[PDB]
Design an enzyme around this catalytic site. Structure first.
Site, PDB file in Angstrom:
ATOM      1  N   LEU A  13      40.951  37.157  31.417  1.00  0.00           N
ATOM      2  CA  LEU A  13      39.919  38.099  31.797  1.00  0.00           C
ATOM      3  C   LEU A  13      40.052  38.518  33.231  1.00  0.00           C
ATOM      4  O   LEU A  13      39.713  39.635  33.546  1.00  0.00           O
ATOM      5  CB  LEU A  13      38.542  37.500  31.556  1.00  0.00           C
ATOM      6  CG  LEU A  13      37.926  37.860  30.207  1.00  0.00           C
ATOM      7  CD1 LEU A  13      38.883  38.335  29.128  1.00  0.00           C
ATOM      8  CD2 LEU A  13      37.070  36.715  29.734  1.00  0.00           C
ATOM      9  N   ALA A  17      41.519  34.003  43.464  1.00  0.00           N
ATOM     10  CA  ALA A  17      42.264  33.256  44.488  1.00  0.00           C
ATOM     11  C   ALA A  17      42.821  31.980  43.885  1.00  0.00           C
ATOM     12  O   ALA A  17      44.033  31.796  43.808  1.00  0.00           O
ATOM     13  CB  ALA A  17      41.370  32.935  45.681  1.00  0.00           C
ATOM     14  N   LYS A  36      36.052  29.640  33.718  1.00  0.00           N
ATOM     15  CA  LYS A  36      36.785  29.708  34.980  1.00  0.00           C
ATOM     16  C   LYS A  36      37.575  28.415  35.095  1.00  0.00           C
ATOM     17  O   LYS A  36      37.011  27.339  34.936  1.00  0.00           O
ATOM     18  CB  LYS A  36      35.846  29.838  36.183  1.00  0.00           C
ATOM     19  CG  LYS A  36      36.544  30.133  37.498  1.00  0.00           C
ATOM     20  CD  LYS A  36      35.631  29.797  38.655  1.00  0.00           C
ATOM     21  CE  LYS A  36      35.904  30.627  39.907  1.00  0.00           C
ATOM     22  NZ  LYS A  36      34.744  30.457  40.810  1.00  0.00           N
ATOM     23  N   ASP A 119      29.331  38.354  48.629  1.00  0.00           N
ATOM     24  CA  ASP A 119      30.491  39.137  48.191  1.00  0.00           C
ATOM     25  C   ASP A 119      30.193  40.110  47.114  1.00  0.00           C
ATOM     26  O   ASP A 119      30.927  40.257  46.138  1.00  0.00           O
ATOM     27  CB  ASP A 119      31.706  38.261  47.809  1.00  0.00           C
ATOM     28  CG  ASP A 119      33.078  39.021  48.052  1.00  0.00           C
ATOM     29  OD1 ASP A 119      33.176  40.123  48.718  1.00  0.00           O
ATOM     30  OD2 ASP A 119      34.060  38.552  47.469  1.00  0.00           O
TER      31      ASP A 119
END
Ligand SMILES: CCNc1nc(Nc2cc(F)c(C(=O)N3CCOCC3)cc2OC)ncc1C(F)(F)F
Length: 259
Positions: A13, A17, A36, A119
């Site tokens: 997906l 980093a 993740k 962010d």
């Protein structure tokens, strides 16, 4: 065909980093989530467990097996806002307004639990199956309010084109006006399909142009006067003069009915 507990890792997906995000399908129950995969993470997980709002990505849990840590999260099957922005065009103003409304609902929520995301940008703003927006990626997030006491931030982070000028100029700054600023850059990008400057510094001609109110230039000339008036209140260089979210919610474009 990787896997973890009952879930098959079926496609990539996104790539961050550290590690990546995979689509995970539970071959028994057929439910699909986002995972993740990594290796800071401690803090991230702690923040993720606080989050419960329809415009922020939900956290389901994690597994630690070996070097690799797996963070199970709500899947946003519509992908990112980045991909609904046509370069040099943006998107229709009514879609941009609806996304903005949702982005503000999420930011209010985060700020209310004392979290700053740090962010905000279109890659971190994901869409569910009905195009509902969700604020994602809490790897730079931090606590700015605890026991009803605010603390100022000192770390510089984010993405230069989205960052507020104070974050480049002051040794310490308030958290909330930095997130509000980056929401105003998102709104510019939605309405004009282009970022207004590389960074909000005195050596960036495009930023100087905006401070001198040259709105006959792009991207500003692509934007209708009502949303542009709001952008004038958001993208204000002094953070204590910058509009707050309670005031954004009274703005005339924000409350304009659109098709
Ligand atoms: C940045 C990726 N992070 C996440 N991503 C998603 N979903 C998706 C992100 C995408 F970008 C795409 C996408 O459109 N792509 C193009 C087709 O090929 C792969 C990527 C599709 C997604 O769901 C199907 N949900 C939750 C997360 C989070 F981890 F934040 F929770």
């Amino acid at each position: 065909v990787p896997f973890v507990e009952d879930w098959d890792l079926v496609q990539t997906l996104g790539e961050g980093a550290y590690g990546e995000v995979q689509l995970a399908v539970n071959r028994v129950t057929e439910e699909a989530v986002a995972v993740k995969i990594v290796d800071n993470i401690k803090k991230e997980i702690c923040i993720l467990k606080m989050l419960n709002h329809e415009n922020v990505i939900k956290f389901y849990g994690h597994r630690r097996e070996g070097n690799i840590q797996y963070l199970f999260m709500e899947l946003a099957s519509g992908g990112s806002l980045f991909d609904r922005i046509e370069p040099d065009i943006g998107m229709p103003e009514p879609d941009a307004q609806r996304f903005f409304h949702q982005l503000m609902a999420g930011v209010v929520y985060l700020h209310g639990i004392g979290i700053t995301h740090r962010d905000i940008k279109p890659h971190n703003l994901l869409l569910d199956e009905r195009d509902n927006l969700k604020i994602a990626d809490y790897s730079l997030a931090t606590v700015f309010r605890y026991n009803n006491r605010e603390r100022l931030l000192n770390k510089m982070c984010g993405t230069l084109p989205y960052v507020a000028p104070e974050l480049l100029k002051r040794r310490e700054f308030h958290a909330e006006p930095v997130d509000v600023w980056s929401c105003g850059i998102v709104l510019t990008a939605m309405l004009a399909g282009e970022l207004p400057w590389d960074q909000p510094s005195d050596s960036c001609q495009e930023y100087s142009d905006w401070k001198e109110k040259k709105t006959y230039l792009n991207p500003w000339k692509k934007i209708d006067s009502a949303p542009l008036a709001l952008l004038h209140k958001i993208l204000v260089e002094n953070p204590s003069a910058r509009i707050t979210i309670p005031d954004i919610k009274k703005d005339r474009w924000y409350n304009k009915p659109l098709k």
